[PDB]
Amino acid sequence: QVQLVESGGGLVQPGGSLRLSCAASGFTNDFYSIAWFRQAPGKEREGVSWLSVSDNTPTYVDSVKDRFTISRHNANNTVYLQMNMLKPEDTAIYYCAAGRFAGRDTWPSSYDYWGQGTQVTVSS
Amino acid sequence: QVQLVESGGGLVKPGGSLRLSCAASGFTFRYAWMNWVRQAPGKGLEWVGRIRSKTDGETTDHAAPVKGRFAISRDDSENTLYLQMNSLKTEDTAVYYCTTDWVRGTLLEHDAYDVWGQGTMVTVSSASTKGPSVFPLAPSSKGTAALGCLVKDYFPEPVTVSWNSGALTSGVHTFPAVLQSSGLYSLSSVVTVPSSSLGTQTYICNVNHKPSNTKVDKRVEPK
Amino acid sequence: DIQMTQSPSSLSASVGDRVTITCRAGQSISTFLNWYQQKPGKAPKLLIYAASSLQSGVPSRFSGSGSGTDFTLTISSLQREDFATYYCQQSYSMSSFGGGTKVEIKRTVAAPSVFIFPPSDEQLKSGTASVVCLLNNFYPREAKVQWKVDNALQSGNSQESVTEQDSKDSTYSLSSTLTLSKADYEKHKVYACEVTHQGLSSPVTKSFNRGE
Amino acid sequence: HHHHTNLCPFGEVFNATRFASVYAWNRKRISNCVADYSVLYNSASFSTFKCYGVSPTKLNDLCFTNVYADSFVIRGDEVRQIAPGQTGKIADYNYKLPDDFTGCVIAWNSNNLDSKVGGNYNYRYRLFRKSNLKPFERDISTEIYQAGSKPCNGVEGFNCYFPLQSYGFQPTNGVGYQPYRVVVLSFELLHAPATVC
Ligand SMILES: *[C@@H]1O[C@H](CO[C@@H]2O[C@@H](C)[C@@H](O)[C@@H](O)[C@@H]2O)[C@@H](O[C@@H]2O[C@H](CO)[C@@H](O[C@@H]3O[C@H](CO)[C@@H](O)[C@H](O[C@H]4O[C@H](CO)[C@@H](O)[C@H](O)[C@@H]4O)[C@@H]3O)[C@H](O)[C@H]2NC(C)=O)[C@H](O)[C@H]1NC(C)=O
């Protein structure tokens, strides 16, 4: 029923940009929330950006605060993560998750719905 | 009626051994952490050691001054806390308290001692025990008169002195002992009373020296 | 095992004053800090736990504050019975106490009442004479007791003991014990202690004649 | 000073020096005061902010008959159990949210407040119970729990255990084992035409 479809990753040079997209289908209403988790090689999943859809409220970690921008296009029911000024630190498998609530959480176990993530690698 | 009562303790030779008991009442003993705290004569409080409830592991910690020489054990079956002291030194001379932690229902603050015992005295010395001689301090002739008792030439600390078996408490001053040059302690206990009660009221100081099993009831009559 | 440096070790204050005591830790102890009050001859009494929380039943004039490394215990308006020594204890790593702070209360001057007690005949049978001079309920603590035997000023054979400050009337009491041998005692007649104190316009002398 | 217009004492709840154990979770009713929830929702102080049955932005636009602030401390891995329709030792035996929960779940990492070298064993949770908690139910009993068919006779032992276990909050714990402080704001709304409020 609920399914998150993911795309937008690839390889870029340090300083370039990249646009991730998360397509959420199977939601009855706008009362859900989207989060972006990235998993560096060997590290645990860590959230970098959140969007509560019902109230249109974004949230970022300090480490990507002025470089990432999260938004949703109401038409295609898709949440976009615009990643500018990418650094080699940002190399990870980026996932998008979803939960039936309005808000944000740092714990992956608080998100019931996931999508096999896209790879983002930044080097030269 | 949360009550802790320490036992054991007294005079013990340098390098010797001694074991202290702590009797718990009024609370479920096996769920409370118990700590030992000591206080040398005229010095500050010093933490000796801690043992946790068996539910929380029953793990023990000891202070650096006593590590390797003191051992804290617990006997939940008898509601008793123990402290086995070994290789005792003179700096181990102190009044030893057992304490339990602060628990007010669902609220809990470990290592905050809210119930203490009366404490037991441990004197580590090579000297020998001696019972005190108790002499009357009679009220003289030359509105309120004063009388008392002299608890002289005893060792080790302490002695306890009451008046009229606890019935006389008002106006009582029991002075802290002094160490005489003879290596023995001397102590006086005095009490002020109306001059009109010297010929109709009988005054008796009850001196108790548990180190020498000495019990003395001394009547004080005007000279 | 963290060093708790308490200050001041002593302080003097009057009824109604505002008192503050400090404990500083050798490293952060979060808020695992407790304050204890110990009265003479008694066990310590828990006043404040978790740096700020006040023990059920302790008067409201007590309060604690602090976090990390520096903590404060405060008495808003002092009282007579609040006289005691205060220790702070950290409960973070193991358990250590502070050096303690003895709070001495202040009051108006009070002259001592002076009594003298001859040696008991039961003690004279033992071969030693002990003469006791009592200075009752005075303030301040400073007092000089001079033993005089046949007007000869004694030194070397007397000891004093002073009571802890009374929790009610804020006064002290002093006991001086002059000790002679029986043979030495029976050579002299007049035994006196001379008490000099701020509350006395001139020294008070209480004396007796041996055998009267 | 006291006036019905002063700001809600949310400081007393969020910044309290000590929290309750989750088995005996605190409940503070909030009345006669004004609140800016939009300031709480956008605070980076909180790592967990999830509202249910109402959006956080419009909390200031609504009318309530009652608001509760429930608080407690759990370990980090257990934060996901403070949500509707969850199971686990906390959701089953300590604090249960109803499936029609109306309110917000707020949590932040409190390692620097509640952890202690050697372990802080103040915080405890219920480990054994015969049945799950009803929503918003609180069980603070410390009676010996009976596992096997043999009676317990008020003492620990064979198939008879104490029902509570203490967290051992050490600063060096993994984040999943670090203490987190939780505030649960639940609301009861006014029955009113939306035209009003
Ligand atoms: C929980 O506690 C934190 C920390 O507060 C700290 O401890 C308190 C007990 C108290 O001692 C505080 O002073 C201390 O910081 C709270 O976080 C603080 O929140 C306040 C207010 O939101 C912030 O202080 C503010 O700083 C602003 C500039 O950066 C300023 O706008 C604020 O008011 C100023 O302006 C007004 C006029 O508009 C003026 O009248 C004031 O006098 C003032 O100058 C205020 O100064 C702190 O930066 C925050 N500190 C931290 C560490 O977060 C938190 O609010 C509280 N939460 C709850 C729910 O109680």
Author numbering:
A (entry chain I): 1 to 124
B (entry chain H): 1 to 142, 147 to 227
C (entry chain L): 1 to 212
D (entry chain R): 329 to 525
Copy text from the publication.
The spike protein (S) mediates cell entry by binding the angiotensin-converting enzyme 2 (ACE2) cellular receptor, and many neutralizing antibodies bind S.4,5,6,7 Mutations in S can therefore impart two important selective advantages: firstly, mutations to the ACE2-binding surface in the receptor-binding domain (RBD) can increase affinity for ACE2, potentially increasing viral transmissibility. In this report, we generate a panel of 25 potent mAbs (IC50 < 100 ng/mL) from vaccinees suffering breakthrough Omicron BA.2 infections. We have determined structures for complexes of four of these antibodies by X-ray crystallography and cryoelectron microscopy (cryo-EM) analysis. The BA.2 mAbs segregate into 3 adjacent clusters, two of which (left shoulder and neck in our anatomical definition of RBD topology) are hotspots for the binding of potent mAbs against early-pandemic virus, while the third cluster, which we term the right chest, spans between the neck and right flank epitopes in early-pandemic responses (note that in the early responses, right flank binders were not found to be potent [IC50 > 100 ng/mL]).
